[PDB]
Coordinates of C-alpha atoms and ligand atoms in Angstrom, one line a residue:
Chain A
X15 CA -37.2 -4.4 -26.3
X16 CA -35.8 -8.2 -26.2
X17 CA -37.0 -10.6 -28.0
X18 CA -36.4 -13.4 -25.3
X19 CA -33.8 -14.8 -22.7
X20 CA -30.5 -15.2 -24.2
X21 CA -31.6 -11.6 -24.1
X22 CA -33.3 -10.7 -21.1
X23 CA -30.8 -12.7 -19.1
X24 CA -27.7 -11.5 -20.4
X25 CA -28.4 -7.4 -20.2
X26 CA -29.5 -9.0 -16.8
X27 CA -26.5 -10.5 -15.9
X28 CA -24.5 -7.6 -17.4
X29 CA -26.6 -4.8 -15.7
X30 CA -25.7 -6.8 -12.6
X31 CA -22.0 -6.8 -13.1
X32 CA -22.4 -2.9 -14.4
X33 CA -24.1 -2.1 -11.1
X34 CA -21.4 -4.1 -8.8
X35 CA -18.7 -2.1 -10.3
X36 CA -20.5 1.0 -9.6
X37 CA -20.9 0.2 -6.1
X38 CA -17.3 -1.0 -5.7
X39 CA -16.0 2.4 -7.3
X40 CA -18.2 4.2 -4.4
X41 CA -16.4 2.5 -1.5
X42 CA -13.0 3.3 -3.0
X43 CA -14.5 6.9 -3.6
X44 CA -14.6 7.1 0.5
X45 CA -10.7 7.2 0.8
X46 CA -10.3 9.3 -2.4
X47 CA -9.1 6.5 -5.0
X48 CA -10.5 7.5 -7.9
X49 CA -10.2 4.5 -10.9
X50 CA -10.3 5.6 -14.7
X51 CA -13.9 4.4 -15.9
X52 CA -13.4 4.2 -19.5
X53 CA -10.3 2.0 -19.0
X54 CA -12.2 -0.1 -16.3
X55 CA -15.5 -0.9 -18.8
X56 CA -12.6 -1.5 -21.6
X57 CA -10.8 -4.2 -19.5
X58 CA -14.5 -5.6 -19.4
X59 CA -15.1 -5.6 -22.9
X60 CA -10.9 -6.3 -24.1
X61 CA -11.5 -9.6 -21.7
X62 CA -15.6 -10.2 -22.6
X63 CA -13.9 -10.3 -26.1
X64 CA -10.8 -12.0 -25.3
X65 CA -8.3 -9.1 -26.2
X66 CA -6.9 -8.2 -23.0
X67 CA -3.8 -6.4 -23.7
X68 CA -2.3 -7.5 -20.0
X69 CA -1.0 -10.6 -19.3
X70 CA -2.5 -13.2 -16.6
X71 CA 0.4 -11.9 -14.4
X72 CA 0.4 -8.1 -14.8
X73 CA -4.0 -8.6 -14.1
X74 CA -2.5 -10.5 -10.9
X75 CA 0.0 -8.4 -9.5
X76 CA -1.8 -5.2 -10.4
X77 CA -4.6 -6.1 -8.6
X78 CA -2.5 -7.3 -5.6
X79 CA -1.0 -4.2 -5.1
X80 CA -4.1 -2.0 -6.2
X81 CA -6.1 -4.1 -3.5
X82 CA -3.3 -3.1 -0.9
X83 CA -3.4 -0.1 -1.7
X84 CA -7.1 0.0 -1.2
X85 CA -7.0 -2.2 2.8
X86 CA -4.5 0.3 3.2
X87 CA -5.8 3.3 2.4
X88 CA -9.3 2.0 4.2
X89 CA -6.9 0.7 7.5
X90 CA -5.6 4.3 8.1
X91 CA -8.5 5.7 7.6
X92 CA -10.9 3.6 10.1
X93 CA -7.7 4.4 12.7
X94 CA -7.9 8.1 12.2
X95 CA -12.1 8.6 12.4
X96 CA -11.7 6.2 15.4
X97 CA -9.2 8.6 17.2
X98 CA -11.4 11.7 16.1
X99 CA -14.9 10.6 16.6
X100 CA -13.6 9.3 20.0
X101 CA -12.2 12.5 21.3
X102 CA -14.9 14.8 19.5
X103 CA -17.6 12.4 21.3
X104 CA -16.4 12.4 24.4
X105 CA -16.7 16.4 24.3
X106 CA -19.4 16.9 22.9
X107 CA -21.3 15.0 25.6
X108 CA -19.3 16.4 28.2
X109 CA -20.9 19.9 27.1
X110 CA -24.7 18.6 26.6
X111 CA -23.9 16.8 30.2
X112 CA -23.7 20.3 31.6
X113 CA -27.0 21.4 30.3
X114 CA -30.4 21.9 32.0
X115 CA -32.3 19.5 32.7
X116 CA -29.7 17.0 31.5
X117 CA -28.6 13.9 33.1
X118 CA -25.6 11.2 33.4
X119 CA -26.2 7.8 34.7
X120 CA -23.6 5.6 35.8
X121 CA -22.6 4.0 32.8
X122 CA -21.7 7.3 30.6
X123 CA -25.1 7.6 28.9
X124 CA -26.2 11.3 29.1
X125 CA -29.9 12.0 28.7
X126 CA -32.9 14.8 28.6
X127 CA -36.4 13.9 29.7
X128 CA -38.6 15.7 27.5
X129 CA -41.8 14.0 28.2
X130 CA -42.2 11.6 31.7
X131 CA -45.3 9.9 30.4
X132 CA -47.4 8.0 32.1
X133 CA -47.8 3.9 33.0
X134 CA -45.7 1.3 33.6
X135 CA -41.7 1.6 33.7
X136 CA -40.0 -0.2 30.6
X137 CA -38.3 -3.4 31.7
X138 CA -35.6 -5.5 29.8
X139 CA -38.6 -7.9 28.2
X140 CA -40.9 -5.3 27.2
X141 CA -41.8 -5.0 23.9
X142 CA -42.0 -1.1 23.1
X143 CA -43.0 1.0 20.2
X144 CA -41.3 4.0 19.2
X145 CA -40.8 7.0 16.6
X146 CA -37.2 8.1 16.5
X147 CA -34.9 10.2 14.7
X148 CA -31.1 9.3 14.9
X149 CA -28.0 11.6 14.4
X150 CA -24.4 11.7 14.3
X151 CA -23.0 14.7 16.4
X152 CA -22.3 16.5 13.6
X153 CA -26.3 16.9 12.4
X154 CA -26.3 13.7 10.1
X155 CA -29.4 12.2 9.9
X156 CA -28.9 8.4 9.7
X157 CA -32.2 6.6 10.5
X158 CA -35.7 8.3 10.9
X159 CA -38.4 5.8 11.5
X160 CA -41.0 8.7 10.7
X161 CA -39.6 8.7 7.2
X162 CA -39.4 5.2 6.9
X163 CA -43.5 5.2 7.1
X164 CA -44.2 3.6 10.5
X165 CA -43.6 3.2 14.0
X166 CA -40.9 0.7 15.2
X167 CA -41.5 -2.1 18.0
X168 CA -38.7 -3.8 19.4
X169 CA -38.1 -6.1 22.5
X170 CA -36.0 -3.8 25.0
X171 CA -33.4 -6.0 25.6
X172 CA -33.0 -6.7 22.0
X173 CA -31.4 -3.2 20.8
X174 CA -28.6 -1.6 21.6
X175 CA -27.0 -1.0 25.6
X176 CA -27.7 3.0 25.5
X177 CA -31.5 2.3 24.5
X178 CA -32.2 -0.7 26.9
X179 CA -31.1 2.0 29.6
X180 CA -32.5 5.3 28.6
X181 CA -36.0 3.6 27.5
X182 CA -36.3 2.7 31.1
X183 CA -35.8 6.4 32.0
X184 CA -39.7 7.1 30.6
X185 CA -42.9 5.8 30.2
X186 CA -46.0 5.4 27.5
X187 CA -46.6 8.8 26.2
X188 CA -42.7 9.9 26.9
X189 CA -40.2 11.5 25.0
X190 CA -36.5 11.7 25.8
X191 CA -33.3 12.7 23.9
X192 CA -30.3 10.1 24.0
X193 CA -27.1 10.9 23.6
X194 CA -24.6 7.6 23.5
X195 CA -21.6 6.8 23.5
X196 CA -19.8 4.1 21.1
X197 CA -19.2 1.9 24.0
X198 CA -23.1 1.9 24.1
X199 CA -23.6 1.6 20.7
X200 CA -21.7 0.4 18.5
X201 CA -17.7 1.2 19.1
X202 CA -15.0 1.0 17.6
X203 CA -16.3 -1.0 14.3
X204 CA -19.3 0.8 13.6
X205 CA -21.7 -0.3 10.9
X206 CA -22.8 1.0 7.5
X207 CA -23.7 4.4 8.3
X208 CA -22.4 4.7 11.8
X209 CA -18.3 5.3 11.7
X210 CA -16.1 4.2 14.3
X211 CA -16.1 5.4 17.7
X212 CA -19.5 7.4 17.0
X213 CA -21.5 9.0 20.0
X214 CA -25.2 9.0 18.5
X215 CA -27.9 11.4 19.4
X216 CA -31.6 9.7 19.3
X217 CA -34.9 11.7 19.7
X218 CA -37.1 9.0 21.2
X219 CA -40.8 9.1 21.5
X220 CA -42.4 6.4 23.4
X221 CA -45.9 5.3 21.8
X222 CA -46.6 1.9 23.8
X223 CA -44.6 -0.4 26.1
X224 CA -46.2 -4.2 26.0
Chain B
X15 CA -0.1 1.4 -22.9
X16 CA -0.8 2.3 -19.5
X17 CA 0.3 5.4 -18.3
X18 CA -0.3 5.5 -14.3
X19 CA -2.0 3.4 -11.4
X20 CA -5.4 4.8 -12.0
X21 CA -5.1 3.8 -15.4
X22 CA -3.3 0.4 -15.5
X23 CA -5.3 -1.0 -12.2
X24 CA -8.7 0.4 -13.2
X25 CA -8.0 -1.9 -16.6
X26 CA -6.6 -4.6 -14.6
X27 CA -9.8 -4.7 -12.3
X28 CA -12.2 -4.6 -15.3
X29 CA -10.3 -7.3 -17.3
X30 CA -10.1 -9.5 -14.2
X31 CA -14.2 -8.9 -14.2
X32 CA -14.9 -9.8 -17.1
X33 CA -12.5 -12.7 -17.2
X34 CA -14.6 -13.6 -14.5
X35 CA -18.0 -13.3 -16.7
X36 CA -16.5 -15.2 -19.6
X37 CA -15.5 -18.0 -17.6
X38 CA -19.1 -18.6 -16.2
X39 CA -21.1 -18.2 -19.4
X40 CA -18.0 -20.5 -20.9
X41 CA -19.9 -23.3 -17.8
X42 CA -23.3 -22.1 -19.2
X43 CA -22.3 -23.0 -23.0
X44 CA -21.7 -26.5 -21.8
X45 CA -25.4 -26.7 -21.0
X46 CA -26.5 -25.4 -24.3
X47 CA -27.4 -21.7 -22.8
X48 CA -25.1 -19.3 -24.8
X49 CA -26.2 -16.1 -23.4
X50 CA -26.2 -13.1 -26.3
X51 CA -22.5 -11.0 -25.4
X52 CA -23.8 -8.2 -26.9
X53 CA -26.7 -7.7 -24.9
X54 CA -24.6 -8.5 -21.7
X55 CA -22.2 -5.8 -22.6
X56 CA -25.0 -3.3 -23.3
X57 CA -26.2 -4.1 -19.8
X58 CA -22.6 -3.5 -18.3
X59 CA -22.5 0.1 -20.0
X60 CA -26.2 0.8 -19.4
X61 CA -25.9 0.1 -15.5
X62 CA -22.5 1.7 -15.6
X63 CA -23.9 5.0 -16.7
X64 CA -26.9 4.8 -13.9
X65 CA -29.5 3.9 -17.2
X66 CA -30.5 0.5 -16.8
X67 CA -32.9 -0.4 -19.0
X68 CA -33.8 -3.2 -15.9
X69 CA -34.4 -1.9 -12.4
X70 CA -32.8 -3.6 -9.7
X71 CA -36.0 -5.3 -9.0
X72 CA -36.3 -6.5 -12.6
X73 CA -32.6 -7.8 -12.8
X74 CA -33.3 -9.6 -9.3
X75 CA -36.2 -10.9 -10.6
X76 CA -34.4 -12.0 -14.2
X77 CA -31.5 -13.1 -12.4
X78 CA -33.5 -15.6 -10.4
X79 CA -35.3 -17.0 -13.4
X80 CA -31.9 -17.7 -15.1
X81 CA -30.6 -19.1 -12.0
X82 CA -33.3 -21.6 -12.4
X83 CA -33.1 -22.2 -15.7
X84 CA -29.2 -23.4 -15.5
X85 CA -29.8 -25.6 -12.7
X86 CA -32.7 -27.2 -14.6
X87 CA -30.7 -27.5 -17.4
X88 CA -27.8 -29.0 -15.9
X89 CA -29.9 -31.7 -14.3
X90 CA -31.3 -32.4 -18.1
X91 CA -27.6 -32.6 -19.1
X92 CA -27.2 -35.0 -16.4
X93 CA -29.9 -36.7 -17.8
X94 CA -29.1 -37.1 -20.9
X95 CA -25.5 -38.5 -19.9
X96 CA -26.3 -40.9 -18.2
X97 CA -28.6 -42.2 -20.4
X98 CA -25.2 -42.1 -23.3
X99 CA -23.0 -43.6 -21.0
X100 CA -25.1 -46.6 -19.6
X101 CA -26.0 -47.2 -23.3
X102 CA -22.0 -47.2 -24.4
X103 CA -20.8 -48.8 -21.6
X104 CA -23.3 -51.8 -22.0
X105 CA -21.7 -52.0 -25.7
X106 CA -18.1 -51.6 -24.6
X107 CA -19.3 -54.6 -22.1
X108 CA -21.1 -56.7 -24.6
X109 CA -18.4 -56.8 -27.0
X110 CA -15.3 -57.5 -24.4
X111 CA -17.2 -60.0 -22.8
X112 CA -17.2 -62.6 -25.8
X113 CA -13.5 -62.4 -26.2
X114 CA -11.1 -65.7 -25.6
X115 CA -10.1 -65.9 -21.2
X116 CA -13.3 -63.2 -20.7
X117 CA -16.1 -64.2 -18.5
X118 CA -19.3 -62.5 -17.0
X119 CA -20.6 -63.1 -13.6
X120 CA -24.2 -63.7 -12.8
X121 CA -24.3 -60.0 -11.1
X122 CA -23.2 -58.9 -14.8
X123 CA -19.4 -58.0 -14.0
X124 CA -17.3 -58.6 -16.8
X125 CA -13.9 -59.7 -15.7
X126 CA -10.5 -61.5 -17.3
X127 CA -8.1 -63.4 -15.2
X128 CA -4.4 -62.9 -16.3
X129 CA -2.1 -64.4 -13.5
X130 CA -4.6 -66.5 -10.4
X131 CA -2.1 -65.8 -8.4
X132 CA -1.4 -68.5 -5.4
X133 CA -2.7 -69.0 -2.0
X134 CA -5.8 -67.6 0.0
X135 CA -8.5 -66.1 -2.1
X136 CA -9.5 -62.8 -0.7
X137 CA -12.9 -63.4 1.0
X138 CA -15.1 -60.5 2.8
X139 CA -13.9 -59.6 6.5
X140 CA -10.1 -59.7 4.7
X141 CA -8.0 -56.8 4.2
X142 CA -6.1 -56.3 0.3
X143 CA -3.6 -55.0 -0.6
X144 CA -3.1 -54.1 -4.6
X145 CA -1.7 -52.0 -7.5
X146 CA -4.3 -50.7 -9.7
X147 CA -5.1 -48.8 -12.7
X148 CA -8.4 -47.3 -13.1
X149 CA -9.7 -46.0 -17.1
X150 CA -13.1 -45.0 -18.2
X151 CA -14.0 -47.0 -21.4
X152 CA -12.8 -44.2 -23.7
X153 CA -9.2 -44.7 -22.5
X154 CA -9.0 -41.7 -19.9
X155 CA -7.2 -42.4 -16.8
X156 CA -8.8 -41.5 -13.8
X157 CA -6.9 -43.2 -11.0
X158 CA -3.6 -45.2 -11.1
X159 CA -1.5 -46.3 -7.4
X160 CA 1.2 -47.1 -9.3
X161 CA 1.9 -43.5 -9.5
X162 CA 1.5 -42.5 -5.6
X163 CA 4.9 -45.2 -5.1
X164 CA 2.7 -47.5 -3.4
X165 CA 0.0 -50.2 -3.3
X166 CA -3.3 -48.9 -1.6
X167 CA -5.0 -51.0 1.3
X168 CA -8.5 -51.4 1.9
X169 CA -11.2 -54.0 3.3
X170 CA -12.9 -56.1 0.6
X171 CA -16.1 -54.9 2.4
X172 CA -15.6 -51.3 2.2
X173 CA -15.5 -51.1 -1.7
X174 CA -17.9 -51.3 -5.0
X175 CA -19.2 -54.5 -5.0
X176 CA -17.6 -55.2 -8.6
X177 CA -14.4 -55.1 -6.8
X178 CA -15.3 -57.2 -3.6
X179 CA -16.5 -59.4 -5.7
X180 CA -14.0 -59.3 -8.6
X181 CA -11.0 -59.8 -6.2
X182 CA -12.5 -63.4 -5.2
X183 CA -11.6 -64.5 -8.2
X184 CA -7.7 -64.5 -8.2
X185 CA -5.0 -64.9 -5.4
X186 CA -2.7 -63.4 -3.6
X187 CA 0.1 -62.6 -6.2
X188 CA -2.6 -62.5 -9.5
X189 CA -3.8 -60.0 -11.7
X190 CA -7.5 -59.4 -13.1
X191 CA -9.3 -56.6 -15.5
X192 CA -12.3 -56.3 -14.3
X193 CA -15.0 -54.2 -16.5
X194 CA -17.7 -52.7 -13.8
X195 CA -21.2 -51.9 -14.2
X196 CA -22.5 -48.3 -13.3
X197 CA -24.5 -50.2 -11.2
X198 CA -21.5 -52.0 -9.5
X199 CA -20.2 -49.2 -9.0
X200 CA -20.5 -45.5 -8.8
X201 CA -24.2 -45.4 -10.7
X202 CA -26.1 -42.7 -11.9
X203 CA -24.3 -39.6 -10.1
X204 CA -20.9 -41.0 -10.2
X205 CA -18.6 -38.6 -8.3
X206 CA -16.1 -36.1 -9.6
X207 CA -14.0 -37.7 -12.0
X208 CA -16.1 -40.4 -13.0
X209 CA -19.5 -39.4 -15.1
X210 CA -23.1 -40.3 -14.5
X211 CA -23.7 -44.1 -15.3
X212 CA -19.8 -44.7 -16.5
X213 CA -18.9 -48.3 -16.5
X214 CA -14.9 -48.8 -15.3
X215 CA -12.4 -50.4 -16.3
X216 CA -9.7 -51.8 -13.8
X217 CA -6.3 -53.3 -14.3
X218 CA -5.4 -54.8 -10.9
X219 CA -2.7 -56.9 -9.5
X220 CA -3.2 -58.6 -5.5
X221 CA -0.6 -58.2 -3.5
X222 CA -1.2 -59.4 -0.1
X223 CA -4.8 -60.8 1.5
X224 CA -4.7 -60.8 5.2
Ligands
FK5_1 C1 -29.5 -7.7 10.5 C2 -30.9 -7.6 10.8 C3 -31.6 -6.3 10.4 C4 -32.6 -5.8 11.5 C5 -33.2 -4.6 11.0 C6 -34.5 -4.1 11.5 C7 -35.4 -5.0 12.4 C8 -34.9 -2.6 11.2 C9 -34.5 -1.7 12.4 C10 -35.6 -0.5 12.4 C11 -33.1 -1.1 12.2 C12 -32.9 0.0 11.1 O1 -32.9 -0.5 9.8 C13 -33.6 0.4 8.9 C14 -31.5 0.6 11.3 O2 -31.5 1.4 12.5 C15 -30.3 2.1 12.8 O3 -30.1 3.1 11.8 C16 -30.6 2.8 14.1 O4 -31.2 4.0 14.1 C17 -30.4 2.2 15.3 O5 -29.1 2.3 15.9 N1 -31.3 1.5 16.1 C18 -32.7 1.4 15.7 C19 -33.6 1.6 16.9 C20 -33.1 1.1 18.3 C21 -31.6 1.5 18.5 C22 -30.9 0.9 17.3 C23 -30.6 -0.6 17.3 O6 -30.4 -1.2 18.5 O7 -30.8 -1.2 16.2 C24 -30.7 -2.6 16.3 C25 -29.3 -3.0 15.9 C26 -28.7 -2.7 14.6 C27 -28.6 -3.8 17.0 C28 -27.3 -4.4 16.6 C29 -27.4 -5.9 16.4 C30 -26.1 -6.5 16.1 C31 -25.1 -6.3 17.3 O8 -23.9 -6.9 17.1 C32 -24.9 -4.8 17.5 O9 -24.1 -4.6 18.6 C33 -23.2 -3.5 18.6 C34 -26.3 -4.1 17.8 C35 -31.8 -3.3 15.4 C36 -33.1 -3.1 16.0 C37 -31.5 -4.8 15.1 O10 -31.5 -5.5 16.3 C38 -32.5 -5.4 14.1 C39 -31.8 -5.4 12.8 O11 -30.5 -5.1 12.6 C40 -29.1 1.1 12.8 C41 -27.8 1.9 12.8 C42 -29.1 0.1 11.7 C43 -30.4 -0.5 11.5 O12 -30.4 -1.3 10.3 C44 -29.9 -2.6 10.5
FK5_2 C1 -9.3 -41.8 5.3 C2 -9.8 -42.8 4.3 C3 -10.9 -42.4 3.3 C4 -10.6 -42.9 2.0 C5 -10.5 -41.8 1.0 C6 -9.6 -41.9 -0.2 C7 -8.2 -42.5 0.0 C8 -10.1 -41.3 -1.5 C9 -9.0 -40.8 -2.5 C10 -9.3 -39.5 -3.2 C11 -8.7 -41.8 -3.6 C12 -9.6 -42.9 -3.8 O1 -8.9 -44.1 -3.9 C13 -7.8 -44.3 -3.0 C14 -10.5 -42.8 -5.0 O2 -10.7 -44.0 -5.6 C15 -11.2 -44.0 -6.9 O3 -10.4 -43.2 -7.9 C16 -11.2 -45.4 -7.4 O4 -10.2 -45.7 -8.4 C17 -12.0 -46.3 -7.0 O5 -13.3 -46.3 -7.5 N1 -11.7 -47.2 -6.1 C18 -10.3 -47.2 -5.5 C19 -9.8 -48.7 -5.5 C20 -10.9 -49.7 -5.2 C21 -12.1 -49.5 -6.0 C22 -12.6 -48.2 -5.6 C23 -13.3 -47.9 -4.3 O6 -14.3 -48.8 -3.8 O7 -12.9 -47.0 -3.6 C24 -13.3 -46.9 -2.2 C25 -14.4 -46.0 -2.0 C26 -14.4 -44.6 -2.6 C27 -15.5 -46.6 -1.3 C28 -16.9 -45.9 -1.2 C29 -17.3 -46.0 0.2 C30 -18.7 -45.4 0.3 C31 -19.6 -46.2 -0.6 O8 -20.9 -45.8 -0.4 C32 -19.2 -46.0 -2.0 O9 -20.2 -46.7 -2.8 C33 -20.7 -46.0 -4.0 C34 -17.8 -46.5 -2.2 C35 -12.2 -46.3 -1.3 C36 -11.1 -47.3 -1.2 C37 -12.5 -45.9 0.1 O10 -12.7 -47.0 0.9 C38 -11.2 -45.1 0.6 C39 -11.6 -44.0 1.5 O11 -12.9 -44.0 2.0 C40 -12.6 -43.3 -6.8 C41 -13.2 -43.1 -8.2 C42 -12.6 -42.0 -6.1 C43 -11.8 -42.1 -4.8 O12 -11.6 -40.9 -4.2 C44 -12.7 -40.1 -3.8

């Protein structure tokens, strides 16, 4: 295929810039902004060729307002799942709270012993090792250590506020369902693949604490 | 040509893109590395349409490799610089220094009185105060006071030694040129503005020793 580097590197670098436009198009996909492709690769190659039929003022103004457009879009949005995933949170552990065998501690973290286990209780500088499966309450899978290929060990104090607490609730050989909320987790802000305001639902099984 | 927002700003982001590309490879040219356009093009389209012929661990891995191979070859341009300049500047030196009023010092600056001036030479602990114009030997003007509205103030210790030593040589009220050594002055890395191994050439008139 090529022959060398001015070769090599330069699908490289374009493959690079080809992929980073493809990611960017997905983010902007989330709040249903939808860019024409074939114009965006023929702004790459009108400018790659020095042809751009826009001026250096029109590029900078229509970016401006497309990239308000875009904080703007991505603003509301964040406000609105905040609001819901609040509100739908807070009732959906409100009903699992009821259940048997379920429990609330004092700081709003609803839980299930499965398992009790046997050994030592968990404490803040314990190094434990787990298999877990974590949810959003609407069923989405978001992290799965068993799929991942092996089990986790972290240092308790080292994770998040709902798992430093429920861990403690078990022991070696346990197994217990948490279900957090975002104030014990990770609120209002989120991160990649947990929206704002999420309650998360964890399937915990405790293989060692060390 | 544009007809709507999804059009004109999805051209817009791609020509400010590869505006972006163009510029940088523009940077690689002046190393001699003049990456092949139509290879990065085919890479854009390729990784646009999910089929790069690179995986993402292949483009990582190429990128990396190029990123090495422009640093490398901007230290050889470096290089080879310094070597053109400390070879023309010894010339320019060699040839001003035989002229009628021109003398050279015993540390090898090259300097030409025009007015002593009167009073106190400037000696080390002193403070200066003086107009200057400062050209690399090819004419270009990197620095002139003149031009701010006012003379610049410094300690004769706190400068390149061709200038603490060059302003010894006149009075308050004269004027010297005085024709610097790389090695007077900013030497092999010079600083931005002033290229590896450039010799300078300053037009300065004393003001005030105190
Ligand atoms: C940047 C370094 C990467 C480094 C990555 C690993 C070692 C791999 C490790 C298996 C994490 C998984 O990666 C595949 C993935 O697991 C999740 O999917 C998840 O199921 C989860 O919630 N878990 C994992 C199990 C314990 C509870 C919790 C957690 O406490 O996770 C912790 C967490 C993110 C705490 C943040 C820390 C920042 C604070 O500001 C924030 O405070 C609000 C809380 C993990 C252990 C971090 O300490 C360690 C890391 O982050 C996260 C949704 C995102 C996370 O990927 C990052
Ligand atoms: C708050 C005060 C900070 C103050 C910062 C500034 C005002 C910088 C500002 C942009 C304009 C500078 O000038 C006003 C400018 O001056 C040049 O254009 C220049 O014409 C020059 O070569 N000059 C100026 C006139 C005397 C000769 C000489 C110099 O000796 O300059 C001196 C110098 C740089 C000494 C270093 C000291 C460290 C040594 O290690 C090195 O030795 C290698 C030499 C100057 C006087 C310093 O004392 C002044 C400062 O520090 C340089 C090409 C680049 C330099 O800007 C970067």
């Amino acid at each position: 295929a090529f022959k060398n580097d001015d070769q090599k590197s330069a699908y490289a670098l374009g493959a690079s810039l080809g992929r980073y436009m493809e990611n960017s198009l997905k983010e902007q996909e989330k709040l249903g902004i939808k860019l024409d492709k074939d114009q965006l690769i023929a702004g790459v190659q009108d400018a790659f060729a020095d042809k751009s039929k826009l001026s250096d003022q029109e590029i900078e103004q229509t970016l401006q307002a497309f990239e308000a457009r875009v904080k703007s879009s991505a603003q509301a949005k964040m406000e609105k799942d905040a609001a819901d995933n609040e509100a739908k949170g807070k009732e959906y552990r409100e009903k699992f709270a009821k259940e048997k065998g379920v429990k609330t501690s004092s700081t709003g973290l609803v839980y299930q012993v499965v398992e009790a286990g046997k050994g030592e209780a968990p404490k803040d500088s314990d190094t434990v090792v787990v298999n877990y499966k974590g949810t959003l309450i609407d069923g989405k899978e978001f992290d799965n250590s068993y799929t991942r290929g092996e089990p986790l060990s972290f240092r308790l104090d080292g994770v998040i506020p709902g798992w430093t607490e429920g861990l403690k609730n078990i022991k070696k050989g346990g197994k217990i369902k948490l279900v957090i909320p975002p104030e014990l987790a990770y609120g209002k802000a989120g991160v990649p693949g947990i929206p704002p305001n999420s309650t998360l639902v964890f399937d915990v099984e405790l293989l060692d604490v060390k």
